[PDB]
Amino acid sequence: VLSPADKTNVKAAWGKVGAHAGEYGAEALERMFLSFPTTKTYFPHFDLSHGSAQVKGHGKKVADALTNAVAHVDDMPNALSALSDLHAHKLRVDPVNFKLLSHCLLVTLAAHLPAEFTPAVHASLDKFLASVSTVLTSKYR
Amino acid sequence: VLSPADKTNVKAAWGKVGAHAGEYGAEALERMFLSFPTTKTYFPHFDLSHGSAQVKGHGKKVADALTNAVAHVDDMPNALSALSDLHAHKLRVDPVNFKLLSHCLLVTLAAHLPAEFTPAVHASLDKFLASVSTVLTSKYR
Amino acid sequence: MHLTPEEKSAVTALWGKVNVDEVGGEALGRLLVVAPWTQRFFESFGDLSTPDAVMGNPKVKAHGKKVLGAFSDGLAHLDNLKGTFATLSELHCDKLHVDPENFRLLGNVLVCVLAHHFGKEFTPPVQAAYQKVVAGVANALAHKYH
Amino acid sequence: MHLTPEEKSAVTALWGKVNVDEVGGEALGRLLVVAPWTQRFFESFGDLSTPDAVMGNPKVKAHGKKVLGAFSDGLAHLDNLKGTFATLSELHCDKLHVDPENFRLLGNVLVCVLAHHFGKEFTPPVQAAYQKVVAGVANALAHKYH
């Protein structure tokens, strides 16, 4: 579970993301594609070339969802229900891939927020991404 | 989330284990130690040889805790509080390992409860061990 | 593989007793039931709405036999699983878009099916050698992903 | 170790700018903070009760520098990691009893640390080369477990 501290941390670090969320979302994806090529199997229909608008488009949607979980940090299961449904029933992404994206999102944030990416914040963001992943995977079986 | 069918299937299966749970506890550990030798890192103080009383006893202990879990299938978090504490603050076993013991336990039930280890029962027990693992690692951070 | 002659012998000898037809259908069907999300690749097979419906689906059973077949033949090239599954590795990547994690889910199901089937015969030392083979197969099959 | 020459040059160029003393302390400290369970190996290190207590503990800093020291040497034998890390693998197994999953956690933390430090210079493709490398090192460290 996320502690008050964690919650503060996440709102704070994400606060700083502001308007770059979209771009950071696109970048996390590209990093993921390059470091874990197996994740590509889920996007056979995408142009995964560098600067692909499909990826930009997708990075933004991922970023809006993360942004929505932060706004509803106290009711994530309900704020993300729909996306939980989609992932369980339609996309059926294997669970191990959430940790990969989580990881690439952390690298991205670290690469952009040197001042905020403190040990304490890193830990909070990691627990958060893990909780988001847990919600998205909750209805799998 | 364990469905009613699931809770039923589990209680049935475990119902047939009966006086043998301890032996199954012991057998699962042995299968874990051989198949995933990295798991042995957590028991440097044990005699891990075949038929060790340290392993047999530990086997019983584990077995018993599962029993208690089946019995309080509706309130696991609560029935296993102490155990979640112990694992998170003292043992600190890495989470990957829970999946390995869970698997050696399926294999063991399968090998011993042929008629009962149907595809639906298999699915249930799996979710169950999954749930149990979640509970035991919920207070890690 | 990093199999011991002793380990090689154990694999080899239990296999000898396997009905690939039956074991292939059961391993694949169990997969579809335990880890429901692997069904994403078999929509064209029909209704997999229930254990019964999966376990009963002939398309499933027949795919299961094709899979264990290939696996079976891999057991004859235990010293170069890489070269035996190269083309199958490309295919899975390039044509089917199957996430290699699936290869590991199946392997574990395979092991539960063998135990199920051989009871006593499937001893800790025998599972241990099988675990090494299933990991080895999965790695070989995943080897050509890019 | 599928490090393309271009991947190896990239690993090597960036490693050129690292202060192993510094990075070592941050990586280690950060691990004890993000995955507190890993603290199990260091109860003789004293106070690890808070992030500041961990990050600043002289013992964590000194140990981190040791670890990265060994890692750095590793980077000069990218060709023979297993060989390079053999006595260390034995030690972690037989004397220290360190679950190898620990090696992968540290690799990921390390990658975030490099991202933290190099900002924009830690490009998608540089990260992918380092991913292969942390993985090679963890595997080499786990090779002698039994």
Ligand code: HEM
């Ligand atoms: C916390 C992590 C994740 C979040 C927040 C997230 C969120 C989303 C959202 C908002 C969408 C678009 C739904 C729509 O069309 O409105 C989406 C689609 C999708 N996601 Fe997830 N996702 C996550 C993890 C993953 C992972 C790990 C993968 C696979 C590696 C994945 C694969 C997909 C695919 C294939 C689609 C559909 C894309 C398309 O066809 O346009 N997702 N996700």
Ligand code: HEM
């Ligand atoms: C299926 C989930 C598990 C259950 C229900 C379980 C249950 C238990 C129980 C009942 C005890 C004994 C408590 C006592 O001594 O009073 C115990 C101790 C212990 N468990 Fe867990 N355990 C599980 C998973 C694991 C795993 C996967 C590992 C590591 C591979 C592990 C490592 C240990 C160790 C090292 C001890 C202490 C042994 C000793 O010194 O006696 N446990 N566990």
Ligand code: HEM
């Ligand atoms: C033990 C590991 C596996 C082996 C040896 C294997 C082998 C095969 C073989 C020999 C084929 C025949 C296709 C052809 O030659 O055109 C095939 C097809 C296929 N496999 Fe795999 N497979 C494995 C695991 C999996 C898993 C775990 C999945 C998904 C859960 C999967 C999904 C598929 C699909 C969707 C096809 C195409 C079937 C069709 O054409 O309708 N495979 N596989």
Ligand code: HEM
């Ligand atoms: C890149 C991976 C790692 C490398 C290269 C590495 C290297 C080293 C070296 C060079 C030593 C000192 C050897 C000696 O005392 O003779 C050491 C000791 C040690 N390592 Fe590792 N290490 C690694 C990962 C880890 C991790 C992740 C952990 C724990 C989670 C760990 C736990 C320990 C402990 C507890 C000691 C002994 C400390 C003491 O003196 O009390 N190591 N390691």
